[PDB]
C-alpha cells in the first residue's frame, strides 16, 4: 500500500538476477547484471524515475554486486536484494539534512520561511499544518497571506489558522504580494514572534510572471529557508516543477503532500537527489498531525514492503 | 464564525429599520422598509446573493413588516429581526426535501447516483465520504471511476475507498467515461450491490465537451439521482456552475463543500432556491464524518449567530 | 477621406452599367444590371457588407433601374448614380429614429442608460463624452463604474468625469458589477439626478460569462435604453459583436467610434440595418465634441464624396 | 488489417453466446443474449461506438436471435454470426443513398458543393482528389479557395490542382471567404463549368466563429450538396464534429479519410447512422485514386474479416 | 490631481517622523527614521514602487536626516519634507539626459527611431504626435507601418499622418515587419527625409515571437534610438514590460502615456531608475500637443502637490 | 513551378543591373549594384529570406560584380546572372555534407537517429519513408513510437510500417517517451538491427515542455544523428522552429517536406545556412520514393528555372 509500481519493478530486477544465479559457490557476472539493469532502466523510466537517479542506481548496484559470490545453497534473494536496498538508501540520503527546530532556536527572530509551489501542490494546508507543528514545539508563528488573487484559498487558510491560534496578515484582494510579506515580518518584529511563514501564489497572473514574483518576494523578505511543496500524485510533474523554482530561487527543503495515496513512487524517490535538498516533511493524511517529519527508514520500508 | 458578511448585512438592515421606529404604539411604515431594503439589495448583491433571492427576500420581508405596530416601550429589534429570520427560512425550504435512505431502500437495486461538478468542487473526496456514510447505514457501495483523464484524482479515490472497504471500478487512462460507469453497474448487478456512485470529469478535454459528456453518461447509466457538488468558497461561481449543469442534466440534490470556511454566505444561501433542489449534505471539515446531512435549523443559526 | 473602399466599389458599378448603356432613347436592360450587380456583390462582400444588406441593395437597385430609359445624349451617370444613392439611403433609414433628449425629458427620473460592447470598442471614453453632451443640454448625470476588473479604465473615466463635473460611483476592485449600478441609481434618486450611465465590462472573467453578466445588470437596473458601442475600424467584427449582444439584451441604439479613420465602410453601412437599431452618435475625433449626433445626410455625402 | 478492435469485440460476443449454446435441438434463450449483449455494450462504448448505434444493434440482434433453435450438431457460430452481420449491415444502410454523378448530370450548372470539417480532417487533399475523380467522369471543375487564412494549405491545393488541370479561384490572404466562393460561382457560370467545389476554413479566427462563417457561406452560395469530411483515426471526435456542423448547416454526405489505418472502427461504423447521411467516399491511401466511392459490401467484409 | 497614492504615502512618512520630533534643539534619531521608513516601504511596495527604488530612497533619506537637529520651535515639516523631496529628485535624474533635437541635427540622415511596447501602451498615437512635434521643429518625417497584422491600427495611423503631412510606408496585411521598415529607410534616403519612425507590433503572432521580431527589426534597421512606450495606468506592468524589451534590445528613452489620469504614480516614479533610461516625453491628454517633453521640475511638483 | 517568388525577385535584380549597364567596354559600377541590392534586400526579406543570408548574398554578389567589364555588344544578362547563381550556390553548400549510408555502415550497431520537429512538419510520414529508403539499401530498421500522446499519428505510423516490413516499438497511451526509445534500442541490440528511428512529440503536454522532453530523450538514447524536419510551406516558421530545437539539442541534418508545393522558397534557401546543417532529404510528393536525397544542382535549377 504505497509505492507499488516502484517496488514491483525493483523486485522484478532481483528475480531476474536470481534466475541467472540459479541457471548458473558461483559468482555474479557483470554481463548478467548489465542486462537485467537495462530492463530495470526501462521500467524505472516508465515509473517517473529521473534519468540521473536511474544512472546513480545502476552505478551503485553494479559496484555492489559485480565480483560477488553466492555460496551455493544459501539464499540468493537477500544478497541481491541487499545491494538494491543499499543503493536506494544512498540516493535518499544524498542531501545534507536540516534540523528545523535547532535552526530556528539558534537564529535571530523572526525566522522567515518562504514556500514555493504550483496550485494544487497542497501548499496552503501544508502551511497551516506546519504552523501547528511549530506551536506544539513552543514557537510563536505568524502567516503572511501573499497569495493575494485567491480569495477562496485565503478564507481556508484563515479558518485553519484561527483554530490553532495563529494570526494571518492579509491585505485586500489583488494586493502586492511582497508588501504583504514585509508587513507580516514587521508585525512579527513588534510582537516578538518566532517564525513567519509566507504563503505564495501558485500561478501567474495577467502581466505578473510567477518566477519573477518569487524573486521579488525573496529579495524583499530575505527568507532563512525556502521550502518547495509538491503533490506526490503528480508523478510526471513535481521534479520539473521543483527544477523551475530552484532556478529562480534556491530550494532548501521539500515537502511532499498526499504521499499515502502515491501508488507509483518514482518521482518521490527522485526529487531530493535531483534538487539536492532534503525532504523535511511528508503529508500522509488529512489531519493536522498527518504532516510528519520525514523519516528515511520509514520511507525505505514503505518502498520495499 | 461562518457567514459573517451575510449576517452583518442582515443585521445592518434590522438596525436601520429600528432607527426609523425610534425617531418615530407606532406603526412600521412601508416607505421606511422600502428605503432600508434598497440598501439591503446593494449589500446582498455584493455578497453573492442571486437577484431572484434578493427579490423573494424583499417580497417576504415587506409583506411581514408593513402594517405592523411596535408597542411603544417594547423590544423593536426582535419584531423586525423575526420577520427577517422567517424570510430567510422560507427561501431555504423552497425545494422539496429528499430522504436518501428511504429512496434507496424502496428502489430496485442498484440505486445509481451520478455526480456533477467542476474540478476543485471537492467532488472526489465527497464521493468517498458519502460511500462511507452509506455503509454506516447498512448499504453496500461501488464507485465508478469515470474521471478517466485524472490519474492523480483516481489514485486518491482508490486510497480512500480501500480504507472503507468499497470497490472502485476503473479502466485505463483516457478510457470512455460512460463505458466505465456501465461496467460498474453490471458489476453491481452481479454482486447484489445496493448503490453505484459515479465519479465524473470536472473539465473538458480535447474534443470532449464537458456538458456533452455528462449527457452521454446520463443516457448510458440512467441515474436515479443526480447530485451537483460545489465549493462554498467559490461564492461568485457555484450558482452559475449549477445552472450550466442543470441545463444539460437536471439536478436533484446539492452538496456544498468547505462550508466551515465560508465567511461570506450569499451563494450558499441562494443555490437551493435558484436550482430548485435541496441541499443534501454539507462538508464542514476534512474527516469522513465531516460530511453532514443538511440541517435547516443548524444552517439558520449559523447565519444569524 | 473616409469610406474609400465602399465608394470605389459603388462607383465601379455605376461605370459598368454606363458602359452597357453606351455600347447600346435606349432602355436599361435587366440582364445588364443583373450582371453588374453580381460583380458588385463580390466587391461589397469583400468590403464587410453584410449579405442581407447586399440583398436589400440588389432588390432596391433592380427595382429602380429596370425599365428606365436614358434619353440618348443626356447624362447617364446621374440617372444610374441616383438609383444607387436612393438605395443606400433607404438601408440607412430603416430603423425607427430616437430623439434622446425628448425621451429623457418625458421620462421619470432617473433615465438609465446601459452600454454594451467589447473592450477596444471605445466604450469608456464614449460614456464620458456623452455625459458632457448631456450636461451641455441641461441634464444632470451620474456614471456607474461597473467595469470592476479594469482599474486602469476606471482611473481614466474618473479623470474625464472630474473635468466635466460628473460624479462616478465606484466600489473596490473586483466588486459585483450589478451592485455598483444599483448603487448609482439609488444615489441618483436621492439627489434628483436626471440620467444614469452604466459603464460595463467588455470581456469575460474567470467564471463570469460576459453575456450572462449583461443579463444580470439589465435585470437589476431595468435600463430605459441599451446602447451598443462599436469600433468602426474593426470592420470584420462590429456586426457579429452587436448580434451577440442583441441576443442577450435587446439593443436600442448604436454608437460607432473612430469613424473618421474608417477607410472601408461596409460594416458601418450595414450595422443599423442588421441590428434594426438607429445609429445615435458617431465618434469622429479625440475631443469631447467629437461625438456627434448621427446625421444621415452627412453620412451619405461622406459615402458618395 | 483495419477495424481490429471492433471485429475482436463482435467476435467475442459470438463466442460468448456460442458457449451458452454448448453448455446447453436447443433454443437460444433471451436471458443468455441479454447478458452477452451487456458485455458487448461495454466493449463497443470503449471502441467509440455511439450509444444510439449500440442501442440499435442490441434491438436488432435480440430480435434476430431470440426464439431461434440450433439443430444440435450443426454449426452454431454461423447462425449467431449471421444475425450480427445483418444487424451491422442494417445500421450502415440506414441513410438514403446518393448517386453523385446522376445528381450532377440532371442539375442546372454549376452544381456547387460545399465542404465542412475541422483542420486535420484531410479536407484540402480530399477536394483535389474529388476534382480529379469528377474530371475522369467527364465533368469540368473549379475550386474556390475559401480557406483564406491558411496560405500553406492553399499553396498545396494550388499545386495539386495545376497537375490535374483544374482552376483555383483565390483572393489575397485574409479575404472574405464567402466573396471568394461567390466569385468562383460567377467564373463557373461564365465558362460553362459543371461543378464548383468550396474549400472552407477548419478553425475559428479572431472574431470569426467557425459555425457562423459556415452559415454565411451557405447563405451566399446556396450549395446543392454539403459534404462533411472527417479523419477516421480521430475516433473519439468525428461524430461530435459532424454533429456540430450538422447543427449549423445540414450535412448531405460524408467522406472519411485515412480509413486504411483505422485499427478501431467504432466511430466509422457509427457516423452515418448518427448524422443520417450516407458515406460517399472513403480515403484509403495517399494517391489520387485512393479516394474510392463507398462500397457497403467491401466495408462489411473489412469489419468481419 | 495625479500621483495621489504616492503623495499621500510620502506625506504620511513626514508626519510620522514629525511626531517623533514633537514627543521628543533636539536631534533626529536614526532609530526613529528606520521605523518610519519600514512603514514607508510597505506603503510604496503597495503603490507599485520597485524594490530597488524603495532601497535607494531609504539610503538617501537616511543619509540626509540622521544627525540632523531641529531647532526647537522652528518648522519641522519642511526640514524632513526637504530631505524626501531631494531623495525623490535624485532618483528621477539618475539617467543621462538626451536632447533629441540636437542628436537629430548632428546625425547623418535619416535618423531612425524604433518604438517598442505592448498593445494598449498608446504606441501608435504617440508616434503620430511625435511626428507632428518633429515637424513643428523643422524636421521632415516618414513613418514605417511595421505593425503589419493590425489593419485597424494602421488605418488610424494613416489618418493622423495625412492630417499633419507625413507619409506612411506600408505593405499588405501580414507583410514582413523588417522589410517594411527597410523600405521606409530607403524611401527616406531617396527623398532627403530627416527622421524615420518605426511603428512595431505589440503582441506575438502564430510562430512569430515578439522579442525575436524586435531583434530582427533592430538588426535590419540599425536604429539610432530605441524608445519604449508604456501606459502609466498599467502601474503593475510597465516596469516589467520595459525589462523584457530592454533584455532583447537596449532601451534609450521612455515615453509614458495617459499620465494625467495616473492617480497612483509608483511605477512612473520607478521606471527611469530601473531601466536606466530618461523619460523623453509624457502624454498628458488627447490632443497632439498633449505629448510634452519631460520636465523634471514639473514632475516633482505634481508628485508633491 | 516551385520557388516562383524567390526566382522572380532574383531576376528583377538582374534586370535592374542590366538596365544600368545599358543606359551606360563599360564597367559595372559599385554604386549601381549597391542600389539594386538595396531593392533586392527589401524583396528577399518579404520572401522569408533570413537577414544573415541576405547579408551573405550582398557580400558575395558585390565581390563578384564590382570591377567587372561588360564587353560592349555581348550578353550582359549572363555575366550578372552568373554572379547571382554562384552566390546562391555558395550559401547552399556552406554546411559540411553527410553521407548517411557510409556513416551507418561504419558505425557500431544500432545507429540511432532522433527526429525533432513540430506537429504538421510531416515528421511521422517522413520517418516511415526513410525507413523504406534504408531497407532498399540493405539496412534493417526499427521505429520507436515516442510520440505517446497521439494515438492517431501512431496508428498511421503502424500502418505504413507494416507495409514495408519494419517493426514499431510502442507502449500504452501517455507512456514515458524516453522509456519507449530506450526499449526500442534494447530490442534492436537483441536482434542485430542496424538502425533505430525515434518518432518524437511535436507539441508540449500539460507539465511536459517540448524542449525539456527532447533533452531527456537525447540524454537517454545518445543518438548518432539528430534530424530536424520542417514543412516548406510554413515559410515564416521553419527557420525559427529549427533555431529553438537546435538550442535544446544540436541539429545534424534537415529534411524539408512538401517542397514541390513551395511557391516562395526564401525559407528553404535559408535554413541550411542559418542552422549550419546540410539538407539530407527533400519531400517532393506523397509516395514513398518521393523522399529524395538532397541534390544541390537539382535545387539550384529549380530556383533559377
Residue numbers in the entry:
A (entry chain B), B (entry chain B), C (entry chain B), D (entry chain B), E (entry chain B), F (entry chain B): 0 to 23, 38 to 318
Authors' account:
The apo receptor was crystallized in two different crystallization conditions in absence of guanine nucleotide and its structure solved de novo using single wavelength anomalous dispersion of selenium; the structure is therefore not biased towards any of the previously solved homologues. Our Pfu-FtsY structure is the first representative from the Archaea kingdom. The Pfu-FtsY construct used in this study encodes the full-length receptor. The αN1 helix of Pfu-FtsY is not bent and its axis is shifted towards the core of the four α-helix bundle resulting in an overall more compact, albeit extended, N domain. In Pfu-FtsY, the N-terminus of helix αN1 is positively charged and could constitute the primary membrane interaction site supporting initial attachment of the targeting complex to the membrane and/or interaction with the membrane-embedded translocon.
The process is mediated by evolutionarily related signal recognition particles (SRPs) and their cognate membrane-associated receptors (SRs also called FtsYs in Bacteria and Archaea). The core proteins of SRPs and SRs are GTPases that each contain a structurally and functionally conserved NG domain where the G domain adopts a ras-like fold responsible for GTP binding and the N-domain adopts a four α-helix bundle fold. Here we describe the X-ray structures and solution conformations of FtsY, the SR from the hyper-thermophilic archaeon Pyrococcus furiosus (Pfu), in its free and GDP•magnesium-bound forms. The low resolution, solution scattering data complements our high-resolution crystallographic analysis and shows that the crystallographic structure and the average conformation adopted in solution are similar. While the overall architecture of the archeal receptor resembles its previously described bacterial homologues from the SRP/SR GTPases family, the structure of Pfu-FtsY reveals novel features: The elongated N domain lacks the N-terminal extension observed in all other bacterial FtsYs and is instead characterized by a long N-terminal helix αN1 that packs against the NG core in a different way; sequence analysis suggests that archeal receptors may cluster apart from their bacterial homologues.
